[PDB]
Amino acid sequence: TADVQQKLAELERQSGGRLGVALINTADNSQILYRADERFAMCSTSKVMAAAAVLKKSESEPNLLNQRVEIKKSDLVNYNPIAEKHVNGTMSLAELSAAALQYSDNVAMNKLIAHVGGPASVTAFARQLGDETFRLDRTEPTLNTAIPGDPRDTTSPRAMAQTLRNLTLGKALGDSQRAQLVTWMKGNTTGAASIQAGLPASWVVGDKTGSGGYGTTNDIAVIWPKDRAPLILVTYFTQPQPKAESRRDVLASAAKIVTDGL
Ligand SMILES: *[B@@-]1(O)O[C@H](CNS(=O)(=O)c2ccc(Cl)cc2)c2ccccc21
Ligand SMILES: [Cl-]
Numbered sequence: 425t426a427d428v429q430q431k432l433a434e435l436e437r438q439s440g441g442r443l444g445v446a447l448i449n450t451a452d453n454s455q456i457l458y459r460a461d462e463r464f465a466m467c468s469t470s471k472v473m474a475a476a477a478v479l480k481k482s483e484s485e486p487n488l489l490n491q492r493v494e495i496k497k498s499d500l501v502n503y504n505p506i507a508e509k510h511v512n513g514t515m516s517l518a519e520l521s522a523a524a525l526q527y528s529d530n531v532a533m534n535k536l537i538a539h540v541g542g543p544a545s546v547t548a549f550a551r552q553l554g555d556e557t558f559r560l561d562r563t564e565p566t567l568n569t570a571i572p573g574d575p576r577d578t579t580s581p582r583a584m585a586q587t588l589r590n591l592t593l594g595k596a597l598g599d600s601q602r603a604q605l606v607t608w609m610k611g612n613t614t615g616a617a618s619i620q621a622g623l624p625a626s627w628v629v630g631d632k633t634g635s636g637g638y639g640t641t642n643d644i645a646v647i648w649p650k651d652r653a654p655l656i657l658v659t660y661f662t663q664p665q666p667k668a669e670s671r672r673d674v675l676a677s678a679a680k681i682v683t684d685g686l
C-alpha cells in the first residue's frame with residue numbers, strides 16, 4: 425500500500441527522528457519496508473543473535489546449555505537485573521540466554537558473547553545463516569553508543585526481519601532449539617510498551633527490545649495474530665540528540681500502521 429508508506433513517512437516526520445521498518449507477512453510472502461536497507465544501531469535487539477549462536481552451538485554439544493558460568497563482581501556492567509542476584513555463584517548458559525532475552529540483562533549478553541568466541545563469532549554466525557548485513561562489533565555496554573554515522577553494532581530492518589524469520593519460523597535452528605528461542609522470546613518482560621502496544625491485545629508476540637544512545641528505541645518481533653499466519657516485524661528508531669529520551673510510542677505507532685487491515 426502506498427498509503428502505509430505515506431503514514432510511516434508522516435510518523436517519522438512528526439517523531440523528529442529516523443525510522444526503519446520491515447514487516448514480513450507470511451500469509452502472502454509480502455513485505456512493508458521503510459528505510460529497510462539503512463543501518464541502525466541494534467542495541468539490545470542484538471541479544472537474539474547471540475542467544476541463537478549459543479543455541480546453534482548446542483546442537484552439537486548436548487551438555488552445553490547446562491554448562492555453568494561464574495558471575496563475578498568484575499562482570500557487572502550497567503544493567504544486570506538477573507546477574508546482580510547471582511554474584512559469586514554460577515548461572516547456566518540456558519539461564520543466561522533467558523536472562524538476556526527476557527530481562528535484557530547485559531552481563532548475560534557478555535557471557536553469551538564470550539562463550540561463542542566474541543563479537544566477530546556472533547557476526548560469523550549471522551553470515552553462516554545468510555545474513556551479510558548484521559555486524560556485532562563490541563561487547564556490553566559500549567555496543568549501545570548508537571552514534572549517527574557509526575556502522576558498529578548495526579544492521580538494517582530488512583536483514584534483521586529476514587534473519588528473525590529464519591530463526592523463529594524457518595530452519596536456521598534445530599527443532600528443539602527453535603522452539604526454545606521462541607519460548608524465550610514469548611516470555612520477554614521488556615516489550616509491552618513497544619510493538620505489542622500497537623497490536624490487538626489478543627495477539628501473541630515474541631519480541632526483543634533495544635534502546636541506547638541518541639534515544640535509539642528498537643523492537644523486533646515474531647507475531648501470531650488471531651487466526652492468521654505469523655508476521656515478522658522490525659521497528660528501529662533513533663534521534664538527533666545524544667541524550668534524547670526513548671520513544672517506544674513511535675514503535676507502537678509503526679506497528680499499528682503496518683498491521684492495520686489484518
Ligand atoms: B538493551 O537495549 O536492553 C537493556 C534494557 N533497556 S531499558 O531501556 O533499560 C529497558 C526497557 C524496557 C524494560 Cl521493561 C526494562 C528496561 C539495556 C540496558 C542498557 C544498555 C542497553 C540495553
Ligand atoms: Cl484490543
Ligand code: NA
Pocket residue numbers: 555557558579580583584585587
Ligand atoms: Na540482521
Ligand code: NA
Pocket residue numbers: 615616617618619620621629631643645
Ligand atoms: Na513488543
Ligand code: NA
Pocket residue numbers: 468528614633634635
Ligand atoms: Na530495551
